[PDB]
Amino acid sequence: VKPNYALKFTLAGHTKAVSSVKFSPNGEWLASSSADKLIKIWGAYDGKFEKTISGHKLGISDVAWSSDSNLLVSASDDKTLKIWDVSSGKCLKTLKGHSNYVFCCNFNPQSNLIVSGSFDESVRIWDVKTGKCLKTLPAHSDPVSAVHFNRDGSLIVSSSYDGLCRIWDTASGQCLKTLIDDDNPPVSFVKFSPNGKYILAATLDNTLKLWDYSKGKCLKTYTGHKNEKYCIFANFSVTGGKWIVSGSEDNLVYIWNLQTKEIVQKLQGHTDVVISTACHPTENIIASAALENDKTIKLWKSDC
Ligand SMILES: COc1cc(CNC(=O)c2ccc(F)c(CNC3=NCCN3)c2)cc(OC)c1
């Protein structure tokens, strides 16, 4: 019915706002990225600081794991992405081509491609092994807020401050569908559901929506949080109860029942906007991270 997430660890070390937290697919790590130009690796279960990964010349707005938990990709204001070997901490490739800040990134499930979105209004598709840019999509007419592959890798969903949500054919780069075709409000985050049938989208009017991709129709709307300014990550929680999880500009983590749309819990503790949340792949564990008045990551655990 409702979860009982409670604060277990607070992870300190970043010196500017945290921008993104992500659990490794094998469950043992949390990665965090920050405006302080650093990636940090933490033990997922005990919050134990593991290492700092450094090399970007300006702040990092997103980081993402490969399917095998061995690689990270980061998106930076230095206009590049970097692919990192987590074990060594070494930068394997620097992905050059965007002409403005890189804001968002993800691997495909095969982990042979990286997709990126930028303030230059484009979506780029990159070959992981060579670091070459395979395609540049003129996807949007304002900064790109999120990019995500579906479960079989054949689709990319993108969102932008231009108000659009578009779905792209990975193989050809051509647009399959414009899911949201408004010019306002900004679409500040999007992500496929784990089975690839639905799309979770945030708009900067304090709204999250669950869309049916195939039918192009809105199935659920989630409200009650504060989101009018920042591109805040949102998540499907699937290890226990089926929830939607999101940060909020009132410094709380919100948890909703996916089916009934009722708020089931609000997690209090951060002292700034909760910009990023992540859900552990096998345990009922949430990671949350906050902006510059706070700069910490918090690990929360639930019995269900
Ligand atoms: C007025 O125009 C704007 C204002 C903005 C406002 N900036 C942010 O919300 C922001 C800044 C730094 C971050 F690290 C993060 C968190 N990172 C992240 N979220 C989803 C993928 N990665 C968010 C954005 C924008 O385009 C994107 C255009």
UniProtKB/Swiss-Prot annotation:
Give Gene Ontology CC terms: ATAC complex; histone acetyltransferase complex; histone methyltransferase complex; mitotic spindle; MLL1 complex; MLL1/2 complex; MLL3/4 complex; NSL complex
Effect the entry attributes to changing residue 195 to A: Loss of interaction with RBBP5 and reduced ability to stimulate KMT2A methyltransferase activity in association with RBBP5 and ASH2L
Residue span of the signal peptide, if any? none
User: An example of a Gene Ontology BP annotation on this entry?
Assistant: regulation of cell division
Please give the Pfam families that the UniProt record associates with this protein. Answer: Beta-prop_WDR5
Mapped WD repeat ranges? 13-52, 55-96, 98-138, 139-178, 182-223, 226-266, 269-303
State where the record puts the cross-link Glycyl lysine isopeptide (Lys-Gly) (interchain with G-Cter in SUMO2). 16
Which SMART domains does the record associate with it?
WD40
Q: Which superkingdom does the taxonomy of this entry point to?
A: Eukaryota
Q: How does it assemble?
A: Interacts with PAXBP1; the interaction is direct and links a WDR5-containing histone methyltransferase complex to PAX7 and PAX3. Interacts with HCFC1. Component of the ATAC complex, a complex with histone acetyltransferase activity on histones H3 and H4. Component of the SET1 complex, at least composed of the catalytic subunit (SETD1A or SETD1B), WDR5, WDR82, RBBP5, ASH2L/ASH2, CXXC1/CFP1, HCFC1 and DPY30. Core component of several methyltransferase-containing complexes including MLL1/MLL, MLL2/3 (also named ASCOM complex) and MLL4/WBP7.
- Give a short account of what the protein does: Contributes to histone modification. May position the N-terminus of histone H3 for efficient trimethylation at 'Lys-4'. As part of the MLL1/MLL complex it is involved in methylation and dimethylation at 'Lys-4' of histone H3. H3 'Lys-4' methylation represents a specific tag for epigenetic transcriptional activation. As part of the NSL complex it may be involved in acetylation of nucleosomal histone H4 on several lysine residues. May regulate osteoblasts differentiation.
Quote the protein name from its UniProt record.
WD repeat-containing protein 5
